[PDB]
Design a protein around this ligand. Structure first.
Ligand SMILES: Nc1ncnc2c1ncn2[C@@H]1O[C@H](COP(=O)(O)OP(=O)(O)OC[C@H]2O[C@@H](O)[C@H](O)[C@@H]2O)[C@@H](O)[C@H]1O
Length: 166
């Protein structure tokens, strides 16, 4: 869990302009967080980048879990293997705002982080799921009590998040 180069936003939330995959390779964290959907079908954002970095081992494990146990709930999570990226991957489902799921469920989604002392994580629902990134960051800061290291890959977005936090 060696995090370096992060900006301190609050006493327990830190942020860095980086690819979450590269950070996981360099930090070797106990938990990396994936922004998932309820079927753990890993798509065009963080999820597909994590899965590719595991040479599809994440998708095979995910398909098996879902076939055996059923889909997650929006706002829910499950802990699976971190493969070569981390010890554990916490798959969390934020609301899909573009499809009319309730943005209030973003608070439930972030509450999952509180079961883990330290996490490398992305901003939930702020990419393919269409939530406002600044709002996602505020919900994270207000909800999460454990230590969270956020990795934001796009520089223009990182800059806009940091400044709105002045
Ligand atoms: N490699 C990356 N590293 C860091 N941040 C990234 C990366 N790729 C995207 N992001 C940023 O992570 C945040 C989350 O974006 P998404 O991964 O698209 O997550 P989400 O909005 O929750 O959508 C989830 C949906 O996308 C699919 O990948 C997934 O299977 C699910 O259906 C966004 O701010 C996005 O810009």
């Amino acid at each position: 869990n060696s995090f370096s180069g992060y900006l301190k936003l609050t006493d327990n939330v830190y942020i860095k302009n980086a690819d979450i995959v590269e950070e996981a390779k360099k930090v070797k964290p106990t938990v990396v967080v994936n922004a998932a959907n309820v079927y753990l079908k890993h798509g065009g954002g963080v999820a597909g980048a994590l899965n590719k970095a595991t040479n599809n081992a994440m998708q095979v494990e995910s398909d098996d879990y879902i076939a055996t146990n059923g889909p997650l709930k929006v706002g829910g999570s499950c802990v699976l293997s971190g493969h070569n990226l981390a010890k554990h991957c916490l798959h969390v489902v934020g609301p899909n705002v573009n499809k009319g799921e309730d943005i209030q469920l973003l608070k439930s989604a972030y509450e999952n982080f509180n079961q883990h002392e330290v996490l490398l994580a992305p901003l939930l629902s702020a990419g393919i799921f269409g939530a406002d990134p600044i709002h996602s960051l505020r919900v994270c800061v207000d909800t999460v009590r454990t230590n969270v290291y956020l990795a934001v890959f796009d520089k223009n977005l990182y800059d806009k998040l940091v400044s709105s936090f002045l």
